[PDB]
Homo-oligomer: A and B are copies of this chain.
Amino acid sequence: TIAVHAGPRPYEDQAVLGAIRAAIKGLQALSFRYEGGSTPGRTREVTPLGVLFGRSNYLVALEGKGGKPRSWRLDRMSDLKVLDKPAPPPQDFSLQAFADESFGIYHDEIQDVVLRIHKSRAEDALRWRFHATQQVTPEADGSVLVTFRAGGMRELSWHLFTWGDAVEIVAPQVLKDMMVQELREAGRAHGAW
């Protein structure tokens, strides 16, 4: 290996990733049993397109000809088979575009987020991708205003924790409340207050 992603992650089945990689390399179809969705236990045949890594891992793939790309949980897939069948990917397809535009459900209300990053971290703010669609505005005093529209306030508050005292939550109020809730939960657990 010459590139490594540092840090914690879900355990991954290497044989599953291996079959996915082999199918993509071969421009071949991939089949698997899927314990989930509409029809659990059914064998699915897909054009594999790539993998999304995160707190959970997903295969990105089209089912059927003309099918739209979907995400499938790796840890719900079994019985992977690399098929003797061609499956060339669409020329148009962008995995990152997929990850932004057609991936990720919010189960909380979407908010207009406004963050002010203190000038001591303005460097990091100006190179940071909070969201595929964000606006970053340097301000007179050296601070940086970051705005984007998104749900996921709890996960966002977890990320904001890594900026320490250098981020001010300007809006929305629910994000301020979330950040206090998560801080109070951990602060009580660990004896901070």
Question: How far is B21's CA from A169's CA once the two chains are assembled, in angstroms?
Answer: 38
Known: A7-B103, A56-B124. 10 other contacts (CB 8 A): A2-B51, A3-B95, A4-B98, A5-B52, A7-B104, A7-B155, A9-B129, A168-B189, A176-B191, A184-B193
Number of copies: 2
Name the B residues within 8 Å of A173 (CB-CB). none
A64 part of interface (Cβ distance < 8 Å): no
Q: Is the CB of B182 within 8 A of A1?
A: no
Name the B residues within 8 Å of A50 (CB-CB). 1-4
Q: Is the CB of B184 within 8 A of A180?
A: no
Name the B residues within 8 Å of A161 (CB-CB). 158, 161, 182, 186
Which 9 A-B pairs rank lowest in CB-CB distance, beginning with the nearest? A6-B54, A183-B192, A165-B189, A2-B50, A4-B99, A193-B193, A180-B192, A5-B53, A3-B51
Known: A10-B127, A164-B186. A52 touches B191 (CB 8 A): no
Docked complex: A15-59 residues within 8 A CB-CB of B: 21, 24, 49-56
Interface size class of A (residues with CB under 8 A): 35 or more
Name the B residues within 8 Å of A68 (CB-CB). none
Q: Is the CB of B179 within 8 A of A190?
A: yes
Of all chain B residues, which has the CB nearest A129? B11
Docked complex: A116-150 residues within 8 A CB-CB of B: 124, 127-131
Of all chain B residues, which has the CB nearest A75? B127
Question: How far is B95's CA from A6's CA once the two chains are assembled, in angstroms?
Answer: 11
Q: Is the CB of B183 within 8 A of A165?
A: no
Encoded as 1 (CB less than 8 Å from any B CB) or 0, chain A from 51 to 88 comes to 11111100000000000000000010000000000000
